[PDB]
Amino acid sequence: ILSPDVSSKSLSAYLDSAVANGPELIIEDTGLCTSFMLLDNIPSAHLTKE
Amino acid sequence: PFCIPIPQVYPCITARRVHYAFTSENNNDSLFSTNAASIDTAFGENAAVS
What we know:
This is part of a larger assembly, with 2 copies of chain A. By secondary structure, chain A is largely without helices or strands. In chain A, 0% of the residues lie in helices and 0% in strands.
């Protein structure tokens, strides 16, 4: 069979909606588990270093 | 709106300012750090990152 998207929703017998709208529970994530940024609101106004 | 003097790192007097509205309570918790890249501050003995 296939995926639950019925492209051919063109005047189909099963009037209105019969198609099994399933949730994709499997959502993969590379990167970093972040919610909040540590944000540098007012950067440091030019300083001299060794 | 709320107004803040910039993070004190200056050898100089302060100029006159006119303020009115003050909070009841110390809401500066959202502050992660002052001027991280300096050795030194100036006025109103603050804390750095916790």
